[PDB]
């Protein structure tokens, strides 16, 4: 069988939450060598 979890949320808009936003990050980041 194929089973799909249900998302209790109300939101309907294909939109990333304010929890997105590319301000906040790092100049750092694990940069491979």
Partner 1 sequence: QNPMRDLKIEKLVLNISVGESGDRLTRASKVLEQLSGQTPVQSKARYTVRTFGIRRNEKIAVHVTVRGPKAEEILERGLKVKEYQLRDRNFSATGNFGFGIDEHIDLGIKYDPSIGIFGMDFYVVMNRPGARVTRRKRCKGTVGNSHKTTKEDTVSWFKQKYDADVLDK
Number of residues that bind RNA (CB under 7 A): 22
State the binding partner of 15 from partner 1, RNA, Mg ion, none, CB within 5 to 8 A by kind: partner 1
Within residues 1-33, the interface with Mg ion by CB under 5 A covers 7
Tell the residue number behind the tokens 């060598």, with chain if given.
Answer: 33
Nearer to Mg ion, 7 or 19 (CB): 7
Tell me the C-alpha to C-alpha distance, in Å, between residue 10 and each of 6, 13, 14, 21, 22: 11, 9, 12, 21, 25
Binding site residues, RNA, CB under 7 A: 3, 5-12, 16, 19-30
């Amino acid at each position: 069988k194929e089973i799909v979890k249900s998302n209790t949320s109300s939101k309907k808009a294909d939109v990333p939450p304010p929890s997105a936003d590319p301000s906040k990050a790092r100049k750092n980041r694990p940069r491979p060598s």
